[PDB]
Design a protein around this nucleic acid. Structure first.
Lengths: 99, 182, 52, 52, 46, 86, 92
RNA sequence: CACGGACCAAGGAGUCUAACGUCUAUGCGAGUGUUUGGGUGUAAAACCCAUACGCGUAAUGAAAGUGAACGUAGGUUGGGGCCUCGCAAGAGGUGCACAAUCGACCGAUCCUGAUGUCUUCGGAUGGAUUUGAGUAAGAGCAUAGCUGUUGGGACCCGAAAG
């Protein structure tokens, strides 16, 4: 925000006139490109599914997304990674059955 | 609880004077090797970090790309002309930006670049760009002013700032409660 | 100019020459001054006669 | 030198042999063998508290 | 252990005296001085 | 301290006495007004001497004190605090 | 009695007292600022630049108005500066 | 008693260093410390020096934090000196350091709880117990000397070992 010029409290700190630095493209390090998406989709079509992904699909069908996410967290080590994998498999299910 | 029962190592600096002589000889040798250029590059002015030291400025590593562009030159040319450039420093303080731009303008006006093919005019060697362009602590306030007291009690101001920071979360929960109460 | 004086600051930054703790080294003349001579009692004898 | 008087292979002969218990040079075939070593009172030994 | 007095032919030897026994212990006046001190210390500091 | 000297001189009947310190007289920036006084001491720090002179007094040595007051007439001899050195 | 406690405040905060506040004015200007004590030309003392974090109010200062700048201040120190006719400006 | 001592010469054992501490001397003094380094040099010397940094000048609380004058920096008692009277003796006056005691100020603890307020934030004012190398006109910093403690082979030689 705007520093309040005093040494304590909310937004504490000295007040100097602000400048906005140019956004460095290294901060755009994880972004996806159209060709990158194309390659990943083609490679997915060619290679298919890993066995743990297959049983994640089965769990999503039968035992629930909560249990699928828990099994994915067991096999990945990270809750955010389990969320990402389960959402990816959900998109795959929707595209492979409905559309 | 437990003592140091073993034997230490000893480093003795008998070579202190010899190494001073050697550093002086090396500086003279480098001056002769790069004459008539200075021994040091131009460095920018920079605020020290942390709240203990942020009250003063010191020399930094190199001028920002934005500052070099504002001074009217490119990073490659500035590096060849004797200016330190640091690509990883960013500008968010217009005071520091303006000081560094003025620093670069003065350096450009004070140096003479010789043509890369033409005959060299005589020019003595100045060893310290740092001495010729010293870092100066920015002037904060004038020495004497008039008194302006509106009875706000700076101590009360500090106490209230602490109180607001301390009870911000509870008042935010109560604001969300006021949002969720119909 | 190197060492300073009562009217010249020494070139050494913040240096002043040492002060004296006694004004005159000759203390015989201080003792023989008029004020002390009219303040003190008469002296005895440096040598004393042997009796008995 | 911190090695002076110290680079010898010597051991005490132990007790009960009617000789001083100072470490002595092992081996044989030279005058050095059997001679006292390492001690500040021994010829060729370390000095006491060697200078550093 | 055959006790051998470090005297006469046996004084100042590093090797083995006339003793036939496998185990021999050389003994000294200096040794008996030290041993007496050790025994009296043992009695006192018990 | 020169503050100690001034407080000593603040006693009634003691304003014109000469203060004697067998030791060092140090300055004190905590006093903003200093009286006119005559002080005899072994050593004056530069700040204390400047303060006494600016207030209009004189700094003398103990032999000058002996000449002026051979019996120590109209003197006030002071000692500094001790238990401070622990 | 909390064990292995590590503090988390402003780690650096050296204190100064009012009876030493006026030493931050140079000797050349101290006399004239003490003599002419005006509210319209009060001397500005930057205690942070002098190297201090908080101002305590132990001593007594003269009645010269002084514009004192500091990061932190005690209630009594502020009261004495205000009584002498100055003001405390908080800075960061 | 035991142990050492045939005789002579030369050698032969409380040392250096680090970190703490007392005492003394010296410098400066609310400060103090030039020697990491830079300058300079008749070149390991001597001479000069910027910016930092340590210690000291503020304590207290578990902590968040708060943070040392009602007053002639208080009263009472004692008190070296000095002052007045006193030709002498004696009495007064003023009182340094320091000591005892009763208060005051800071921090911590427990109560009163108001002026003001986004209604619960703020703690004005007034009380009681103790407590601290606290405040109450600073005493420190540095270097040397003799020394003490501890660690380094640690006064010298000698130990049943892994």
């Amino acid at each position: 925000t705007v520093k309040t010029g005093i040494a304590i409290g909310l937004n504490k700190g000295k007040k100097v006139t602000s400048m906005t630095p140019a956004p460095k493209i290294s901060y755009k390090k994880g972004a996806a490109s159209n060709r990158t998406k194309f390659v990943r989709s083609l490679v997915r079509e060619i290679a298919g599914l890993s066995p743990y992904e297959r049983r994640l699909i089965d769990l999503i069908r039968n035992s629930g997304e909560k249990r699928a996410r828990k099994v994915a967290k067991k096999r990945l080590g990270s809750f955010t990674r389990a969320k990402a994998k389960v959402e990816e498999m959900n998109n795959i299910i929707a595209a492979s059955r409905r559309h | 609880h437990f003592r140091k029962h073993w034997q230490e190592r000893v480093k003795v600096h008998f070579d202190q004077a010899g190494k001073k002589v050697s550093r002086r000889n090396a500086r003279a040798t480098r001056a002769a090797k790069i004459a008539p250029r200075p021994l040091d590059l131009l460095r920018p002015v920079v605020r020290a970090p942390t709240v203990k030291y942020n009250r003063k400025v010191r020399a930094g590593r190199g001028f920002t790309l934005a500052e070099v562009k504002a001074a009217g030159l490119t990073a490659a040319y500035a590096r060849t002309i004797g200016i330190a450039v640091d690509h990883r420093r960013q500008n968010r303080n217009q005071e520091i930006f303006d000081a560094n731009v003025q620093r670069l303008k003065e350096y450009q006006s004070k140096i003479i670049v010789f043509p890369r093919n033409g005959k060299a005019p005589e020019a003595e060697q100045v060893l310290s760009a740092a001495a010729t362009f010293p870092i100066a602590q920015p002037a904060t306030d004038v020495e004497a002013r008039a008194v302006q007291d509106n009875g706000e009690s700076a101590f009360r101001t500090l106490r209230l700032a602490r109180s607001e920071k301390k009870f911000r979360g509870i008042r935010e929960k109560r604001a969300r409660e006021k949002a969720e109460a119909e | 100019q190197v060492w300073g004086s009562e009217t010249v600051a020494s070139s050494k930054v913040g240096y002043t020459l040492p002060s004296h703790i006694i004004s005159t080294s000759d203390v015989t003349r201080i003792i023989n001054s008029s004020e002390i001579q009219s303040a003190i009692r008469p002296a005895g004898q440096a040598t004393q006669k042997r009796t008995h | 030198s911190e090695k002076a008087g110290h680079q010898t292979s010597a051991e005490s002969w132990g007790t009960g042999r009617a000789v001083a218990r100072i470490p002595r040079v092992g081996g044989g075939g030279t005058g050095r063998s059997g001679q006292g070593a390492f001690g500040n009172m021994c010829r060729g030994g370390r000095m006491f508290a060697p200078t550093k | 252990v055959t006790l051998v007095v470090a005297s006469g032919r046996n004084k100042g030897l590093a090797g083995r005296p006339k003793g036939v026994k496998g185990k021999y212990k050389m003994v000294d006046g200096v040794m008996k001085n030290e041993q007496r001190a050790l025994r009296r210390i043992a009695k006192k500091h018990h | 301290s020169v503050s100690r000297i001034a407080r000593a001189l603040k006693q009634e009947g003691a304003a014109n006495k000469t203060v004697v310190v067998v030791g060092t007289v140090t300055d004190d920036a905590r006093i903003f007004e200093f009286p006119k006084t005559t002080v005899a001491a072994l050593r004056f720090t530069a700040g204390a001497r400047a303060k006494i002179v600016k207030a209009g007094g004189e700094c003398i040595t103990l032999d000058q004190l002996a000449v002026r007051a051979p019996k120590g007439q109209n003197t006030l001899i002071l000692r500094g605090p001790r238990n401070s050195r622990e | 009695m909390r064990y292995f406690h590590k503090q988390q405040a402003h780690f650096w905060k050296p204190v100064l007292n009012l009876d030493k506040l006026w030493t931050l004015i140079p000797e050349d200007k101290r006399d004239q600022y003490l003599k002419s004590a005006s509210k319209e030309t009060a001397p500005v003392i930057d205690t942070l630049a002098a190297g201090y974090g908080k101002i305590l109010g132990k001593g007594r200062i003269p009645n010269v108005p002084v514009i004192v700048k500091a990061r932190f201040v005690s209630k009594l120190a502020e009261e004495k500066i205000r009584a002498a006719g100055g003001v405390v400006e908080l800075i960061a």
